[PDB]
Design a protein around this ligand. Structure first.
Ligand code: JQN
Ligand code: JQN
Lengths: 546, 546
């Protein structure tokens, strides 16, 4: 039985095939048929192209050798080449236009999800062109999705030589009969078939995928829209900044470009942005996903005042100071959203742009104390139960797995009675001891949050709700200001605490505010609707955050 | 006696003073004298400007209020303002042209070096302009050099109100008689003098500095060229990437912009780039200063083969893969330099540009084994003593302080006999047990390297020299290639192992190679000549690495 799938890059995982450019070029330039492909294949396994693919020479060294083969191929067929003609120009465009074959990637991902060992096997070159980054970016993206990437120029062997195939079996630690091999070049397909491997000639993706699904017995074609790429914690770059003697801040970092700082809510983690981190990095941003003060690998001092908004924001400014960042885009959810609006108001110089998921910006009422204000809405009663130190800590820390499984659920999966929690005398009253697994989460993900909360518990997290009065007084200083820097408000239709209607007057304080709205989305926005969140964020970042 | 110095920003630490723009504008536009300054100061402590400086309103909200005051100031004096006239345009240019007053910064740094508590006290605003980053960048740079930064808009108090002064004493935890206060506005100077503080009216920097040196008793004017800013390890952002199950890589990170990856030599540390990290970040780069495999907080597996060049380079590619970086500029010294040339040769796609300090690129001789090659030069005899496992480890680990103090010395400070170490039967033969402190290093810096080498010792570091044969075979695959990506070779005049002449033929393999040369510079290039290294690197990065 099959347990490994192998794919070529050109014509299989990446389209349009770079080899096809020779054919299009001669047709566009009305040149003799196959003239470009003959110059490209001159000398066979002794010629320029084989040397390049084995890694003997770099692409920049090969460019003039291919041109010499082009003048030799033209003089025989009695033809003239134009003066505007450049081989580098032709290849630059072909490499630049070659994009990932998404349905083929999805199929490769689905096979790996189902236990298959996957690999890319390609005839490639050492790219030293001034424009090499384009391909480095494509390869970097593609490679993370496979167990192995075998490149001809790195192994010094080429397809169709039999050595590379034996090297491929050796890497996969599998018998040829356990391997499906996909290629667009019949010649390169032959030696794999010869060893007894299952082969697929790839012409059109759809047919190749039909051949793949019948041979693996797994549905790969027409399957549902897959979730965005997530994060495996152990494969991330983990960063640590000391902001003051007793306070260190932890973050996960991915990508290059403008710094985007992601701020989670209560009782969350950097992992809460797992579906946004690869997506935002791929979109051209440097993502810094925080473990906010009180959470995960970040310090959790006991004192209530360590979690007032003023202190939290000053510490976030020091975080940028110590990392040498003059600015960052700040994107927050729930308590992170509140932090992010106050970063925009108090430190507009350090905030490139501001975005909030679910959390609206509501100016403090200087006439009404926040305890009065919170009491006026029955949906905010849980926050009053959070006030007394040690009480909610006790309940939420008793069974970590039950806590997260009960919390992290979609709009139609509610198990916790969010009303009259003070009257009921408990947050977990009339709730299962063993809740069902929400469709949003896996057992492993819940267990990641469980392990994270084992270090400091709920004291620091709950303290974020225990500075209602300090936060109110601090907020009153900002009453005459407006948020005039780029801003995005994203509302979640089915969040019954942070309701979309609560954001209705924000235009009065943020006139140029931009918006997004997600239908059928609960409180846990990022994992409830990851695809839409990424769509809205990337669209807004590219237009407003540069 | 004086123990604290306080400086204003505008007109003191930053020039040309932004307040002076009002005067230049009216003179250039041939407008009534003081017209701009009257509109700027309209309503006094009740008007627009005071509100802005206290933080009641942001700069963008103030812009139209100042314009309203400009139409009111012009109608009284019977004058017309042009149609091309914009207040925002005037302030944008004034903020943009305002640069750091380097001699004033040097003086502030020298006072802090001598035990003074230093602070910036300024009347500033909440900057929310599209161009706010310019000032955020200036403030971020300036602030790191002081114990405190008190901003009017953040504290909600302004100069000359007496409250801010009492707030300043409170922050400094010092009596007014212990404080020197520097300001360009006599009015803002008055309340400090009134409390008994030492004051300095700042008109021209030179005179202000003369007044400062006589009052502190420390030479601040005409003093020698200071060393570049260094790194305090505890204030850095520390990053950790797992490249394989048993291998994690540690790095220090600072700045934004293109990623510059710094690779140290033997037996060094990320700290070896201490003088380059702030300088390169300030120059517009994202610096990643590595703890190379075998060093510091990075993993140090015991096996010799874990340190062959192929493995080291593959791990550096995975480092970029896990951080989500398609490329980095690679800058290396000694063994890091060798790694960096092999990164350019084997992975040109992932290398934006390559730079080496001291280490030349020499192609492998396919006819001569590296043991023969190394033997041909008597300066390389220490490398033969490094070959036998456990021998050099024993000597170098016996006294860590003696090891580093003996090694880290300038060209005229040599204490170790580098010749016939095998014949002498020891690396430390006829060398002091307690060497003098080199002028390049402080006791604290040596002790940082001592603490770093306490975790894994010298086995992993020495293993870099123990793959002569594997490295040679691997290098032979690259014999037909050329380095065609941007490249810099920096030679050190007095390095007697890695001599400048050894780099003489590099143009044959790197035709577009760029060069730098540092005279009177030993092996430890970065700490021997930090200023010149930074000059050469920044100049090359800005022209060749974008
Ligand atoms: C028992 C309990 C109740 C509330 C919280 S706060 C975080 C939370 O669970 C939550 C917040 C807002 C919200 C929902 C859950 C569901 C919803 O629609 N809005 C924590 C523990
Ligand atoms: C005892 C000993 C000898 C050599 C080394 S290698 C690093 C080193 O110390 C060094 C390398 C090159 C070099 C100098 C020192 C001085 C110089 O001019 N070139 C380590 C320990």
């Amino acid at each position: 039985t099959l347990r490994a799938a192998v794919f070529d890059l050109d014509g299989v995982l990446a389209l349009p095939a770079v080899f096809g450019v020779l054919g299009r070029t001669e047709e566009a330039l009305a040149l003799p048929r196959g003239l470009l492909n003959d110059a490209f294949q001159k000398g066979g396994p002794e010629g320029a192209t084989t040397r390049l693919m084995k890694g003997e020479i770099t692409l920049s060294q090969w460019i003039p050798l291919m041109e010499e083969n082009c003048r030799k191929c033209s003089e025989t067929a009695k033809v003239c080449l134009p003066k505007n003609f450049s081989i580098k120009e032709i290849f630059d465009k072909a490499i630049s236009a070659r994009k990932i074959n998404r349905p083929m990637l999805q199929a490769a991902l689905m096979l790996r999800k189902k236990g298959f060992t996957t690999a890319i096997l390609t005839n490639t070159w050492l790219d030293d062109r001034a424009e090499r980054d384009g391909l480095a970016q494509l390869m970097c993206e593609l490679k993370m999705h496979f167990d192995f990437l075998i490149e001809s120029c790195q192994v010094g062997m080429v397809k169709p030589e039999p050595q590379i195939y034996k090297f491929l079996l050796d890497t996969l630690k599998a018998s040829p009969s356990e391997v499906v091999f996909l290629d667009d070049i019949g010649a390169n397909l032959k030696p794999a078939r010869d060893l007894g491997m299952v082969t697929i000639l790839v012409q059109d993706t759809d047919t190749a995928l039909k051949e793949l699904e019948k041979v693996t017995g797994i549905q790969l074609l027409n399957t549902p829209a897959p979730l965005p790429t997530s994060c495996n914690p152990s494969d991330m770059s983990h960063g640590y900044v000391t902001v003051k003697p007793r306070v260190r801040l932890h973050f996960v970092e991915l990508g290059s470009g403008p710094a985007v700082c992601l701020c989670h809510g209560f009782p969350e983690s950097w992992y809460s942005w797992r579906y946004q981190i690869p997506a935002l990095a791929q979109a051209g941003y440097r993502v810094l996903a925080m473990d906010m003060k009180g959470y995960g690998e970040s310090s959790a001092p006991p004192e209530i005042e360590e979690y007032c908004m003023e202190v939290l924001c000053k510490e976030m400014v020091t975080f940028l100071d110590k990392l040498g960042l003059s600015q960052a885009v700040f994107i927050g959810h729930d308590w992170g959203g509140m932090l992010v609006w106050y970063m925009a108001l108090f430190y507009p110089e350090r905030v490139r742009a501001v975005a909030s998921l679910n959390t609206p910006f509501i100016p403090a009422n200087p006439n009404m104390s926040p305890l009065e204000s919170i009491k006026a809405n029955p949906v905010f009663d849980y926050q009053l139960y959070f006030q007394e130190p040690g009480v909610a800590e006790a309940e939420l820390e008793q069974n970590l797995s039950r806590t997260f499984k009960s919390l992290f659920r979609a709009s139609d999966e509610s198990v916790l009675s969010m009303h009259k929690v003070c009257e009921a005398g408990g947050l977990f009253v009339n709730s299962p001891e063993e809740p069902s697994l929400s469709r949003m989460v896996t057992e492993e993900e819940i267990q990641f949050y469980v392990q994270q909360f084992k270090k400091s518990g709920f004291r620091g997290p709950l303290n974020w709700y225990r500075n209602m009065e300090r936060n109110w007084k601090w907020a009153c200083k900002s009453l005459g200001r407006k948020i005039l820097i780029p801003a995005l408000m994203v509302t979640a239709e089915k969040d019954f605490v942070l309701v979309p209607q609560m954001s209705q007057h924000m235009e009065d304080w943020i006139p140029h505010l931009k918006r997004g709205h997600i239908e059928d989305c609960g409180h846990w926005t990022q994992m409830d609707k990851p695809t839409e969140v990424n769509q809205i964020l990337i669209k807004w970042l590219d237009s407003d955050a540069r």
